[PDB]
Design a protein around this ligand. Structure first.
Ligand SMILES: [Cl-]
Ligand SMILES: [Cl-]
Ligand SMILES: [Cl-]
Ligand SMILES: [Cl-]
Ligand SMILES: [Cl-]
Ligand SMILES: [Cl-]
Ligand SMILES: [Cl-]
Ligand SMILES: [Cl-]
Ligand SMILES: [Mg+2]
Ligand SMILES: [Mg+2]
Ligand SMILES: [Mg+2]
Ligand SMILES: [Mg+2]
Ligand SMILES: [Mg+2]
Ligand SMILES: [Mg+2]
Ligand SMILES: [Mg+2]
Ligand SMILES: [Mg+2]
Ligand SMILES: [Mg+2]
Ligand SMILES: [Mg+2]
Ligand SMILES: [Mg+2]
Ligand SMILES: [Mg+2]
Ligand SMILES: [Mg+2]
Ligand SMILES: [Mg+2]
Ligand SMILES: [Mg+2]
Ligand SMILES: [Mg+2]
Ligand SMILES: [Mg+2]
Ligand SMILES: [Mg+2]
Ligand SMILES: [Mg+2]
Ligand SMILES: [Mg+2]
Ligand SMILES: [Mg+2]
Ligand SMILES: [Mg+2]
Ligand SMILES: [Mg+2]
Ligand SMILES: [Mg+2]
Ligand SMILES: [Mg+2]
Ligand SMILES: [Mg+2]
Ligand SMILES: [Mg+2]
Ligand SMILES: [Mg+2]
Ligand SMILES: [Mg+2]
Ligand SMILES: [Mg+2]
Ligand SMILES: [Mg+2]
Ligand SMILES: [Mg+2]
Ligand SMILES: [Mg+2]
Ligand SMILES: [Mg+2]
Ligand SMILES: [Mg+2]
Ligand SMILES: [Mg+2]
Ligand SMILES: [Mg+2]
Ligand SMILES: [Mg+2]
Ligand SMILES: [Mg+2]
Ligand SMILES: [Mg+2]
Ligand SMILES: [Mg+2]
Ligand SMILES: [Mg+2]
Ligand SMILES: [Mg+2]
Ligand SMILES: [Mg+2]
Ligand SMILES: [Mg+2]
Ligand SMILES: [Mg+2]
Ligand SMILES: [Mg+2]
Ligand SMILES: [Mg+2]
Ligand SMILES: [Mg+2]
Ligand SMILES: [Mg+2]
Ligand SMILES: [Mg+2]
Ligand SMILES: [Mg+2]
Ligand SMILES: [Mg+2]
Ligand SMILES: [Mg+2]
Ligand SMILES: [Mg+2]
Ligand SMILES: [Mg+2]
Ligand SMILES: [Mg+2]
Ligand SMILES: [Mg+2]
Ligand SMILES: [Mg+2]
Ligand SMILES: [Mg+2]
Ligand SMILES: [Mg+2]
Ligand SMILES: [Mg+2]
Ligand SMILES: [Mg+2]
Ligand SMILES: [Mg+2]
Ligand SMILES: [Mg+2]
Ligand SMILES: [Mg+2]
Lengths: 124, 189, 103, 136
RNA sequence: UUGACCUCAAAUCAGGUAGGAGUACCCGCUGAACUUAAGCAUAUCAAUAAGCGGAGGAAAAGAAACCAACCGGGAUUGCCUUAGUAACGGCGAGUGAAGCGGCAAAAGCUCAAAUUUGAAAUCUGGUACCUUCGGUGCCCGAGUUGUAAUUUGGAGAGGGCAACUUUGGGGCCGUUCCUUGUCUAUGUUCCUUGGAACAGGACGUCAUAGAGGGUGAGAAUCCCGUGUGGCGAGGAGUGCGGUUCUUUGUAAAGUGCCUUCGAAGAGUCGAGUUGUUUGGGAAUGCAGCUCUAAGUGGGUGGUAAAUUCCAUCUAAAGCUAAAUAUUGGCGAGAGACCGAUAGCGAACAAGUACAGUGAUGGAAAGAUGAAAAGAACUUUGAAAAGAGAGUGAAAAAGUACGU
RNA sequence: CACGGACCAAGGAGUCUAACGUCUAUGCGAGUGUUUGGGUGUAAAACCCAUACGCGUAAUGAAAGUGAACGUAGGUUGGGG
RNA sequence: GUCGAAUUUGGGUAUAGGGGCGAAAGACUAAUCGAACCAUCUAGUAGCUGGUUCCUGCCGAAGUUUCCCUCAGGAUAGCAG
RNA sequence: CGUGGAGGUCAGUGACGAAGCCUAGACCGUAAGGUCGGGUCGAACGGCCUCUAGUGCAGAUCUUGGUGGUAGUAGCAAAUAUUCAAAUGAGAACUUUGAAGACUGAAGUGGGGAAAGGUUCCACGUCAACAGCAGUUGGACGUGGGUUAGUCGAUCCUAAGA
RNA sequence: CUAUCUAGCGAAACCACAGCCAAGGGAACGGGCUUGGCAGAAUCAGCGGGGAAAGAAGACCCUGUUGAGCUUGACUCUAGU
RNA sequence: GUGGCCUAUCGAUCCUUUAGUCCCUCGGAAUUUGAGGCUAGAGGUGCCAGAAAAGUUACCACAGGGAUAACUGGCUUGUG
């Protein structure tokens, strides 16, 4: 239960804050959980999604398909996987928007800042 | 407009009264605010007791003169009899009122005793600043309460001199009523 | 806004209602009729050890409650959660559930 | 003199009790009018007090005392830098001077029950309905 | 002639300051009528709306020319009460306070009037330098038609005698407060339905976390958060918890006794009259005009006057936190409130479109689907489109779209 | 041969408040009223509390004022039980 | 009808609501004039006209008395629950 | 009896279809109403004990919105007037060209301006709506182009006046 | 030139429900009620007897303890003088 | 015998005034004026249960009224 006077349980306020969240805040909202292999290796539970991450789909009709993230569409609260698309009747192909909470990260894109984030969260 | 057997009513609502309606929705909120304000004031004033010592005085008017209550402050004479100056008394936690005067020995003696007991029950920290840490008592009124003075013993012997209390009251009224006319007749003779 | 919202109740009559409520907790038929699952509880009122006041963890508190016969009442609360049936859902009253034991 | 009511040709358009034009009196004294006009003339200053000097059949004469709140001899003086507070801007306009408080009826005792704490403030308190959560 | 003084001017002179906006609440001025009285003029509506001037985060009020008649109380403000009472009123309709008592909050004060007269001891500005919300030196100026020290009625001052008691001004480190960042649990394991499991069933885990929101349908355990704690970053205020640098100072303050004194506010109080206002009634306050004081005096003591007493304060000069107010502004938390003809006029490119010369007036209008996957291609027609095909869980969802 | 009504959908009119009369229910009872305020709290809830104040327990006079038992708190007639 | 004049007319300018302007009709003052238009006081008052939203059950009226600037309204007694 | 919302309870119903809507189909109640089947539909909702109100419509020349009969009806008749052929086009009484017949008749239906409007000017493309028939045309729709000053005006002066 | 007929285009007033009479009674002049006469789809151009036809909460008259313009030694006041 | 042989011959509140009682109050305490109360009359409301009140509208307004007049119709038939 809520114990702080600075936080609110109002449904109207929470939904408004979600749909008007700026770009920087939407990055935290678009977090994905790591795989059991990576969870044991790094010791952390979940991370914000990044463009060069390999993912596995664990929900929906695309379950079981892997790939690498091609775009993080923050405006639409979705990500796109390079090899997960849909063919139209005219022959063209369009990417399918997926929510990161329905994905599992299998390989991470590592740079100086990503490593610092893992260490900041208690990882190794 | 006037019908049936009903009392005459006087409800003063012929002005724009709805523009001046005050509902105390914040009764609970103000109680929290006052309690918060008292708590933060106690922490600000060190171990000081959050209130000043007050004297005991007789309430005016014949209706309320049977009781004693708390007055604004001790008189200059009461402070002097306690053995200190008015200026130092103010800085030590004692309220001083310069416009009240002493005419009753019972009230004067009681307030002198209150000042003496107060001085023996407080500790005054030196100006050097070592400041030993003592527990804060939040009230001086509770520490030094006001009690109604004793009046008579529980039981006593009956002493009747044969006079009548009703007769005494009647004669007292008669003397006051005719005092002016009796003096004029005596003076004219 | 100056409609009357709160109601005065005599202090003594208020304590009369409280005392009647306490005495009603000792009647098994009344407790069962109120929807509580106390069918196989040995004795009403149920009195437990004083060391219950020193339990720090939810896990051991639940185990203690189940060990004295309150397991069925706990399961009633969990399985009774429902969505509210009107406009109160978007007025911060979205879910309803039954009442469990009072400790 | 008096304050003639500024209505066209003396017509008031109302009930007879409000039909008077000539024998009406201004509620503020002529001394108050003197301070206010001086205050507008020198708006960079603060009015402190004023006093009577002379009078003829047509005019009354007054001298008004003014203090400059910007001058360093005032701002650095402990006995007078209270006037530099923004709460004291245009004291004469709000009747906060000595003559203003007299016309406002700001005095102690039973003779000033209507105006002791402010006439309009007192009227609001006496004409307010007070309702509590648990109705008395 | 020359040099001052007084008064009055000038300068794109050196440095400053005022205006306008907002106005919920606050301090004043000015000021109605509809209405009620079953008509109506006094009255009532109302010392209200409209109009005008002036402030702040509160304003205003405030340390008694008070209340009282008691064994007296003791600045102001607010709440409970006094009380629909005393009183006012074509004594009709109606109107209507205050002292005491309980409580919230508590805080006190300073000028004028005295010869520093063995020393204007005071201050703006300029300039140079410096530890720059200021300091020091020097030089003009202000000022004796009175700038400092000293004293505000509770007192207090000038002399004489005898005594002890107590310090001031800065650094730095922490604390208090506010503005912020970061870290800190537990399943997406099997079966069925479905386009989608967040549904049902079985078996587990965490819980000081089963508030709330999101994610393809009701998700504590998928994501953000929630609960409990830890670790940082930047400022304000000297409130104070420790340390450290300066002796301020033949400085300052308090207390006993003797003696001599003890300055206290004027066209003001008060009085007559006129108008207005008040519960204030031979007149409550305010204002105009006329008259105009006193110093053992003066004001008040709710019925006018003469005479004699008593009680109580000290006007005509000034400052001051908290308890109180707040349909405005900024930041938050909520509801037995409304659910698109409701709720603000406005859930939308709403004070918008549009109307009026102008002041002003002022709408209508929310919902495809989880995802455009928004219908390739064939065929008829000049075309719009039609008929097939196709997408979708559903075209009995086709941008004239939920039902 | 009086007035409103061409048709349909949605909206559309004895409410709340201050002070009171009668009646009824409830608590306590010569008393009664915790909620101005204080304490406390799982925090606009619940729980606890001092002093006052309101009404009642005395009336009657314009007022100064005075103030309710000769008696099984009376006698007589009718009265349920 | 009148048509060289007390003529007709453009533009500039002045007069503003109990006010203006009028060779005078109570005419004209932005389709508004025996007192313009706009907003507010204002949800102004009405003894007068209209309307006033579900069912069943039981009881069931009055247009009469007295007073009122009372005669289309009230008070009062009666009838009713 | 029925409606919006609130406390409690039925460990109530539901994507294997909740609510709503349609149904000369069935059942219960004197009635207010309640219940069931079928169709349509897609996400919430009900019974009982109590609490609460912005709680029930046929009317108010009621409010807002929508829709009829009238009715393919009244009517689309002032300003003398049109006709033939070709071109263009899916389509021509109305567009373009040619020919013919007419009118305004210089106080004009001609040629320029002051106010006022504001791109209506010009070209190309182009016809859903608008031009009370029509339309290939247009002051319509879409996309672009266009207003050149020492001498013309403003600017300067003063008028009633402000 | 309309009306009239055709192609195209296409409103409004008004509307309780409607539309054959005689007498009767009736709110004292019925389309409906009572008794009789009667009575056969769908229609076009005309027509002004009726629908007490439509257009407006009668401007006349009275009532209201509703107004306004104007007048006067009505009651009560007022600018100016 | 508590006015006229009997049945009519008359008047609230507020205010003023008179008589009576010389009584009660002016609220810090007294004396004397003055004022205010208690009881009983008078000054009057004839619209007589008791507002203080001139006209006009043919420039007109509003709420209503067939409770109510100016046409027909209906009843009546004095009059014709
Ligand atoms: Cl549910
Ligand atoms: Cl008087
Ligand atoms: Cl808004
Ligand atoms: Cl307009
Ligand atoms: Cl008496
Ligand atoms: Cl104007
Ligand atoms: Cl039924
Ligand atoms: Cl024919
Ligand atoms: Mg009680
Ligand atoms: Mg529903
Ligand atoms: Mg300069
Ligand atoms: Mg004010
Ligand atoms: Mg009236
Ligand atoms: Mg009336
Ligand atoms: Mg009138
Ligand atoms: Mg105003
Ligand atoms: Mg400000
Ligand atoms: Mg404050
Ligand atoms: Mg202030
Ligand atoms: Mg003083
Ligand atoms: Mg006081
Ligand atoms: Mg008043
Ligand atoms: Mg005035
Ligand atoms: Mg009087
Ligand atoms: Mg008097
Ligand atoms: Mg002040
Ligand atoms: Mg709306
Ligand atoms: Mg969708
Ligand atoms: Mg479907
Ligand atoms: Mg009618
Ligand atoms: Mg009609
Ligand atoms: Mg409805
Ligand atoms: Mg309704
Ligand atoms: Mg009611
Ligand atoms: Mg002319
Ligand atoms: Mg005329
Ligand atoms: Mg109304
Ligand atoms: Mg109205
Ligand atoms: Mg019957
Ligand atoms: Mg009627
Ligand atoms: Mg269904
Ligand atoms: Mg049907
Ligand atoms: Mg859906
Ligand atoms: Mg309603
Ligand atoms: Mg309807
Ligand atoms: Mg009806
Ligand atoms: Mg209608
Ligand atoms: Mg025609
Ligand atoms: Mg035709
Ligand atoms: Mg025609
Ligand atoms: Mg023609
Ligand atoms: Mg011709
Ligand atoms: Mg010709
Ligand atoms: Mg063109
Ligand atoms: Mg056309
Ligand atoms: Mg066409
Ligand atoms: Mg265009
Ligand atoms: Mg017939
Ligand atoms: Mg007949
Ligand atoms: Mg008919
Ligand atoms: Mg018939
Ligand atoms: Mg028949
Ligand atoms: Mg005809
Ligand atoms: Mg006809
Ligand atoms: Mg009418
Ligand atoms: Mg009319
Ligand atoms: Mg009448
Ligand atoms: Mg009139
Ligand atoms: Mg005789
Ligand atoms: Mg007196
Ligand atoms: Mg009469
Ligand atoms: Mg009269
Ligand atoms: Mg009649
Ligand atoms: Mg005859």
């Amino acid at each position: 239960a809520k114990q702080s006077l600075d936080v609110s349980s109002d449904r109207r306020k929470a939904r408004k804050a979600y749909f008007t969240a700026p770009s920087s805040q939407r990055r935290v909202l678009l977090s994905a959980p790591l795989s059991k292999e990576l969870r044991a290796q790094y010791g952390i539970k979940a991370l914000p999604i990044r463009r060069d991450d390999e993912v596995l789909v664990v929900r929906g009709s695309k379950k079981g398909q892997e790939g690498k993230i091609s775009s993080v569409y923050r405006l639409k609260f979705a990500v796109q996987v390079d090899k997960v698309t849909k063919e139209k009747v005219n022959g063209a192909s369009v990417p399918i928007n997926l929510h990161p909470s329905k994905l599992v990260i299998t390989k991470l894109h590592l740079d100086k800042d990503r490593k610092a984030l893992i260490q900041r969260k208690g990882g190794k | 407009a006037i019908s049936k057997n009903l009392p005459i009513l006087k409800n003063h609502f012929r002005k724009h009264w709805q523009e001046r309606v005050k509902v105390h929705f914040d009764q609970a909120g103000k109680k929290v605010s006052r309690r918060n304000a008292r708590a933060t004031r106690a922490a600000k004033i060190a171990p000081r007791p959050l209130d000043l010592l007050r004297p005991v005085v007789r309430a005016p008017t014949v209706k309320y003169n049977r009781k004693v209550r708390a007055g604004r402050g001790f008189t200059l004479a009461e402070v002097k009899a306690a053995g200190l100056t008015a200026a130092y008394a103010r800085t030590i936690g004692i309220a001083v009122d310069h416009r009240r005067q002493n005419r009753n020995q019972e009230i004067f003696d009681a307030n002198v005793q209150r000042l003496k007991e107060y001085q023996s029950k407080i500790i005054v920290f030196p100006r050097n600043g070592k400041a030993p840490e003592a527990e804060q008592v939040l009230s001086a009124a509770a520490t030094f309460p006001i009690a109604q003075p004793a009046t008579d013993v529980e039981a006593r012997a009956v002493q009747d001199n044969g006079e009548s209390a009703f007769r005494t009251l009647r004669l007292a009224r008669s003397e006051k009523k005719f005092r002016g006319i009796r003096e004029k007749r005596a003076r004219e003779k | 806004t100056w409609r009357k919202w709160n109601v005065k109740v005599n202090h003594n009559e208020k304590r009369y209602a409280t005392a009647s409520a306490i005495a009603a907790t000792a009647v098994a038929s009344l407790v069962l009729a109120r929807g509580h699952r106390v069918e196989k509880i040995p004795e009403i009122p149920l009195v437990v050890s004083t060391d219950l006041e020193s339990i720090q963890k939810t896990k051991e508190a639940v185990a203690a409650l189940k060990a004295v016969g309150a397991h069925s009442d706990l399961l009633k609360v969990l399985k009774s959660k429902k969505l509210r049936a009107g406009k109160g859902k978007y007025r911060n009253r979205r879910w309803t559930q039954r009442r469990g034991p009072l400790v | 003199g008096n304050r003639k009511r500024p209505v066209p040709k003396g017509a008031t358009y109302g009930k007879p009790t409000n039909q008077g034009v000539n024998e009406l009196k201004y509620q503020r004294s002529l001394r108050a009018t003197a301070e206010e006009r001086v205050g507008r003339r020198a708006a960079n200053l603060r009015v402190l007090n004023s006093y009577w000097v002379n009078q003829d059949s047509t005019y009354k004469y007054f001298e008004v005392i003014l203090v400059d709140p910007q001058h360093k001899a005032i701002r650095r003086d402990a006995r007078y830098n209270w006037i530099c507070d923004p709460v004291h801007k245009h004291r004469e306009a709000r009747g906060l001077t000595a003559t203003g408080k007299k016309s406002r009826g700001i005095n102690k005792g039973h003779k000033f029950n209507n105006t002791k704490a402010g006439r309009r403030k007192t009227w609001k308190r006496q004409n307010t309905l007070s309702l509590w959560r648990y109705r008395k």
